[PDB]
Amino acid sequence: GMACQFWSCNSSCISRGYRQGKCWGKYCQCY
Known part of the structure; x- marks a missing residue:
């Protein structure tokens, strides 16, 4: 699955x- 939504975290970052935007068990950290 995914811990934070792709269509939100990528499109935000x-x-x-x-x-890119990725999940870490804590928050959608942009990088």
Whole structure:
């Protein structure tokens, strides 16, 4: 599955300016 929603975390982080957004058991950290 996924711990944080792809269609939210990618579309958030790339709008803010990052290459990707991923889950870590804590929060959608952009990088």
